[PDB]
């Protein structure tokens, strides 16, 4: 029975790619990084604290500027921050309250959103009448979006339930590529630094690398026990970490096409829902369901610091692109800037 | 450069006021989430009491529910986005002998949650009178989906309706007690699920959905202040 | 990589017996509740019986109370469905489901078309 002979090939190509993977693995990274000295105790201390959200925040995102940043909140809104003074630029209302994902454009002109309403939703900043409001809204996906990042002021890319991530043209609004394979939603997705590719975290423990420009997905990366909640982008971009529900972080590499190390300690039994590196990425910073953050020493695997102050789970969290300070959202309503 | 200052100051306190405004708007919106299998009451409940979203008034409180429809059936991630909702209005078909187990599991699976432990549930037995309907024509049994039923004694607390054959007060009770079963094992009286027996032309099922939220915020106030 | 091999299952006469063993893969087997999820030809997906962390608690289906058994060994790293008294009707594929978050008690692992912690099957067949 040909699916049955489809089945017996998957699994003679399942252990070809377990040996040649077993084959690369000549050392752990534990053993190479052992001589290292450790980062030390890394106590870093709220700044600043940005009020104003009615219900729980669920996305952020800085700017490019490392001064502004964008949240989202599921009491319908999206609140654009001047960080440094604490200041609110723009207070956009949306028109679906179950908002889950937020980004900012590079070039700082536009603003995008969407969640349970299957839309992602952008926003002129640099209107001309004076306000922001909506420009396009790009439709397609039959589940929720979980995560967007722009790419320029015209390409966008989109994660939706519906187990497919898909690259946008903001202006025709039609899906100018779709990447499918994945079995489960699609929870998170990171750019490489050069646009070029892109990582994605889905509920069936995998994460996937994709090429932008082709469609394709080159590697699938597994591991993880339970659902990828978080994922990111190591700085220098041939690298990326994982956050899953079983409570534990990994770092693959992506030239080596497998997990190099796992962060974990036996008390936290909490699923990681949000992670990012700082500038040079040496600390992993993760943000527990447990209401605390913790600080990561990417390379040891030792923890370092941790980030009390919230009284419900850390919903997000994200570092500037100048590496000077870090912010986190949480369902408490609160973001709070630590440096 | 201070000018620049000072209007975003004043930038600052326009959105400030109208962010004042919004506060007590959604302040005094109670979200309420539907959910429940297909082929059940859910949206002939939306339809009587008059899309994703349904807002209605009950005694100059408003109320805005949703029941989530395009999505696929992988609850496990989206249903996060309600831990924060008043309460969940789950609706069951009592007719349907054989789907009940999933609906039982489905809120066994939602009442234990980590992040709905503090959701309180409105539970609607819908579709009794087909129950009923089931229950006299007596050819698909509830014992041989629930063997527990054959040793089942109707409650003494039970008030059946005029005319209601002691069967299906015994099955709609049974059905009752499987949901109550699962409700009383693990609530520490963060949360509660409250039974209602519909049918589908019943018109107050608002009402109900009023009190209830009324009961949840008064029980939330008394375990506030450790008296209940 | 998560995956579940299940074992066991062939035809078997009304009242027979059978054993379908589940072995696990990828993970840690005792954190994990499990489930049974059968399919009959025609229908959708429908639950057997679950079994907690360790043993502690479990439970059926109606219609299989008192007939089926569902034990955990964390040793072996594996569960078995003990079937006993086997009907016409419990002819169906087997799926070894888990629930997909470890140290909690809820799961939605039922699904219509796609779960993805749940294995392939063993089609047990009874008839005369």
């Known amino acids: 029975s040909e699916l049955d002979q489809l089945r017996q090939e998957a699994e003679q190509l399942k252990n070809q790619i377990r040996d040649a993977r077993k084959a690369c693995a000549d050392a752990t990274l534990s053993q190479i990084t052992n001589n290292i000295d450790p980062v030390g105790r890394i106590q870093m201390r709220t700044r600043r604290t940005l009020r104003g959200h009615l219900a729980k925040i669920y996305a952020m995102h800085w700017g490019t500027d490392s001064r502004l940043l964008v949240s989202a909140s599921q009491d319908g809104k999206l609140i654009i921050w001047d960080s440094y003074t604490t200041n609110k630029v723009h207070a956009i209302p949306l028109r679906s309250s179950w908002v889950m994902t937020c980004a900012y454009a590079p070039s700082g002109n536009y603003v995008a959103c969407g969640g349970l309403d299957n839309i992602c939703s952008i926003y002129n900043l640099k209107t001309r009448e004076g306000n922001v409001r909506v420009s396009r809204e790009l439709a397609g996906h039959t589940g929720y979006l979980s995560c967007c990042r722009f790419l320029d002021d015209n390409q966008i890319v989109t994660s939706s339930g519906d187990t497919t991530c898909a690259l946008w043209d903001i202006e025709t609004g039609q899906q100018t590529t779709t990447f499918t394979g994945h079995t489960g939603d699609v929870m998170s997705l990171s750019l490489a630094p050069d646009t070029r590719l892109f990582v994605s975290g889905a509920c069936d423990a995998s994460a996937k690398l994709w090429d932008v420009r082709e469609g394709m997905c080159r590697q699938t990366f597994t591991g993880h026990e339970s659902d990828i909640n978080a994922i990111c982008f190591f700085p220098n971009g041939n690298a990326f970490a994982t956050g899953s529900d079983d409570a534990t972080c990994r770092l693959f590499d992506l030239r080596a096409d497998q997990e190099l190390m796992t962060y974990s300690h036996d008390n936290i039994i909490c699923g990681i829902t949000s992670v990012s590196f700082s500038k040079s990425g040496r600390l992993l910073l993760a943000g527990y369901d447990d209401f605390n953050c913790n600080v990561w020493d990417a390379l040891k695997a030792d923890r370092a610091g941790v980030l009390a102050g919230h009284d419900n789970r850390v919903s997000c969290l994200g570092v500037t692109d100048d590496g000077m300070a870090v912010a986190t959202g949480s369902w408490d309503s609160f973001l709070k800037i630590w440096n | 450069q201070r000018n620049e200052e000072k209007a975003q100051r004043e930038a600052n306190k326009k959105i400030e006021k109208q962010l004042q405004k919004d506060k007590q708007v959604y302040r005094a919106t109670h979200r309420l989430l539907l959910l429940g299998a297909d082929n059940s009451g859910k949206s002939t409940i939306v339809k009587q009491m008059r899309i994703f979203e349904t807002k209605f008034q009950v005694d100059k409180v408003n109320f805005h529910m949703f029941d989530v429809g395009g999505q696929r059936d992988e609850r496990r991630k989206w249903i996060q986005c309600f831990n924060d909702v008043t309460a969940i209005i789950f609706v069951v078909d009592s007719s349907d002998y054989n789907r009940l187990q999933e609906a039982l599991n489905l809120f066994k699976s939602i009442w234990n949650n980590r992040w709905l432990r503090t959701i309180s549930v409105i539970l609607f037995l819908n579709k009794q009178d087909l129950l009923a309907e089931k229950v006299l024509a007596g050819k698909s049994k509830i014992e041989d989906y629930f063997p527990e039923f054959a040793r089942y004694t109707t409650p003494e607390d039970a008030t059946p309706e005029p005319g209601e054959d002691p069967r299906v007060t015994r099955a709609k009770y049974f059905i009752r007690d499987e949901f109550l079963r699962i409700s009383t094992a693990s609530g520490d009286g963060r949360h509660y699920c409250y039974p209602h027996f519909t049918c589908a032309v019943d018109t107050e099922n608002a009402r109900r959905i009023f009190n209830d939220c009324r009961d949840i915020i008064q029980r939330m106030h008394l375990r506030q202040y450790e008296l209940l | 990589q998560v995956q579940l091999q299940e074992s066991g299952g062939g035809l078997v006469q009304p009242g027979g017996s059978l054993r379908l063993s589940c072995a696990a893969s990828?993970?840690?087997?005792?954190?994990?509740?499990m489930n049974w999820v059968r399919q009959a030809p025609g229908k959708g997906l429908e639950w057997v019986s679950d079994?907690?962390?360790?043993?502690?608690?479990?439970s059926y289906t109606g219609s299989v109370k008192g007939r089926f058994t569902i034990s955990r060994d964390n040793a072996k790293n594996t569960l078995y469905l003990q079937m006993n008294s086997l009907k016409p009707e419990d002819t169906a594929v087997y799926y070894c489901?888990?629930?997909?978050?470890?140290?909690?008690?809820?799961?939605?692992?039922?699904?219509?078309?796609?779960?993805?912690?749940r294995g392939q099957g063993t089609q047990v067949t009874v008839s005369s």
């Open positions: 489901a888990r629930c997909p978050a470890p140290f909690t008690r809820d799961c939605f692992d039922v699904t219509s078309t796609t779960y993805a912690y």
């Open positions: 990828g993970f840690t087997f005792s954190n994990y509740k």
């Open positions: 079994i907690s962390q360790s043993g502690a608690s479990i």
